[PDB]
Design a protein around this ligand. Structure first.
Ligand SMILES: CCOc1cccc(C(=N)N)c1
Ligand SMILES: CCOc1cccc(C(=N)N)c1
Ligand SMILES: CCOc1cccc(C(=N)N)c1
Length: 330
C-alpha cells in the first residue's frame, strides 16, 4: 500500500503545515500538523475543555462506529516551545492520503495550552518520530507510520515541504519525479527517539564550505533551523545590521536586507537554503525589524533541522530495520 497527501502552510510565513487526516467511520477530516519530532497523534475533540476550543475542527469519538475507548490510557506532552496538551485515548481507523490504519491510537485532548487554542488552523498533531517517544501510559502506543509500515510497499515516508506553497507527504514509495539529481542517504541514531543524524558542515552565501560535524534532528514540526551559536553567528555576521535581541528572543535583521543563502552538508552532498527562506517577516505588524529563520540552538540542547532546512530538500525518512535519512535537491 501507499498514501499521498498534500500539506499546506498555515499562513504566508510557512509557520507550520497542515495535512488532512481522516479519522473514524464515517470519516471525520481534521487538519493535523505532521511532526517528525514527536510520536503522539493527538486531536482536538468533543472532550476538549470548551473554553480551550476556538475554531478548530474536533474529533467526536461517539459519532464513529469504529471508535473504541483504550480504557485506562492517558497521555500528556510538553513541546520544545513550551506548549502542551493531555487527555485520554480512543483507537480508531485513521487514513492519510488513501493509506488506512486500523486500531490507531487517537489521543483525544481534554486540555490544550494557550498556543494551541490561539491557532485555529491546527486540529492536532500526527507524530512521525520513533514510537519510543510516545507518551501514552500505561501502554505506550505506535505512531501511524509504525502501524502502517508492514503494509507499505517500502518502509519509508517522504517530506516535500513547499516554500510559500503546498507540498506533499508520501508513505510507502519515493516519487522519483519530485527531486533533482540523486538522494544522499545518511545514518540515523534512534537513541533519543528522533530522526537524529550528523550534517557534514555548512557554508554561508558564496563562502567556503566549513567541514564540521553537526548532530541534529530532522523535525517537520519545528518552523526554524536551530544550529550551534558559532554557526549562527557566522551566518548573521554577513547581514548588515543583524543582531541577537534578548527582547525579541533571537536574531533580527533589517527588513531592507537581502539575506545570503545557507548550505548544509549531507555526506558529500550539499543542500542550499535560499536566503528568502530565512525571512520570517516583521517582528510585529509594521516593524522594520524582521525575524531570522536561523537561530541558535544554545539552551535547547539539540540542533534542529526544522522546516527552513527541510523545505529546501526532498527528504526520505527510511524506517527500514536500520533507519536512514535521505536528502535530495529539488
Ligand atoms: C519539549 C518539546 O521538545 C521538543 C524537542 C524536539 C522536538 C520537538 C517536536 N515535537 N518537534 C519537541
Ligand atoms: C513541536 C511542535 O510544536 C508545535 C506545533 C504546532 C503548534 C504548536 C503551538 N504552540 N500551538 C506547537
Ligand atoms: C522589502 C521591502 O519591504 C519589506 C517590508 C517588510 C518586510 C520585508 C521583509 N524582508 N520580509 C520587506
Amino acid at each position: 500500500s501507499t498514501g499521498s497527501a498534500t500539506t499546506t502552510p498555515i499562513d504566508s510565513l510557512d509557520d507550520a503545515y497542515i495535512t488532512p487526516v481522516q479519522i473514524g467511520t464515517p470519516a471525520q477530516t481534521l487538519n493535523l500538523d505532521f511532526d517528525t519530532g514527536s510520536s503522539d497523534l493527538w486531536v482536538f475533540s468533543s472532550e476538549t475543555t470548551a473554553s480551550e476550543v476556538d475554531g478548530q475542527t474536533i474529533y467526536t469519538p461517539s459519532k464513529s462506529t469504529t471508535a473504541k475507548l483504550l480504557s485506562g490510557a492517558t497521555w500528556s506532552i510538553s513541546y520544545g516551545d513550551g506548549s502542551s496538551s493531555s487527555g485520554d485515548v480512543y483507537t480508531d481507523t485513521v487514513s492519510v492520503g488513501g493509506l488506512t490504519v486500523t486500531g490507531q491510537a487517537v489521543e483525544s485532548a481534554k486540555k490544550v495550552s494557550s498556543s494551541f487554542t490561539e491557532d485555529s488552523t491546527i486540529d492536532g498533531l500526527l507524530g512521525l518520530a520513533f514510537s519510543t517517544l510516545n507518551t501514552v501510559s500505561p501502554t505506550q502506543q505506535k505512531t501511524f507510520f509504525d502501524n502502517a509500515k508492514a503494509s507499505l510497499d517500502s518502509p519509508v515516508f517522504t517530506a516535500d515541504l513547499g516554500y510559500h506553497a503546498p507540498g506533499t507527504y508520501n508513505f510507502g514509495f519515493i516519487d522519483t519525479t519530485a527531486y533533482t539529481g540523486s538522494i544522499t542517504y545518511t545514518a540515523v541514531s534512534t537513541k533519543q527517539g528522533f530522526w537524529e543524524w550528523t550534517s557534514t558542515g555548512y557554508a554561508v552565501g558564496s563562502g567556503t564550505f566549513k567541514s564540521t560535524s553537526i548532530d541534529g534532528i530532522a523535525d517537520t514540526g519545528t518552523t526554524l533551523l536551530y544550529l550551534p551559536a558559532t554557526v549562527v553567528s557566522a551566518y548573521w555576521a554577513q547581514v548588515s545590521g543583524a543582531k541577537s535581541s534578548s527582547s525579541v528572543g533571537g536574531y533580527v535583521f533589517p527588513c531592507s536586507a537581502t539575506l545570503p543563502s545557507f548550505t548544509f552538508g549531507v555526506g558529500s552532498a550539499r543542500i542550499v537554503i535560499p536566503g528568502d527562506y530565512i525571512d520570517f517577516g516583521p517582528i510585529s505588524t509594521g516593524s522594520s525589524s524582521c525575524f531570522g529563520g536561523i537561530q541558535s540552538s544554545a539552551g535547547i540542547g539539540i540542533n534542529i533541522f526544522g522546516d527552513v532546512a527541510l523545505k529546501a530538500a526532498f527528504v526520505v525518512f527510511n524506517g527500514a530495520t536500520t533507519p536512514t535519512l535521505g536528502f535530495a535537491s529539488k
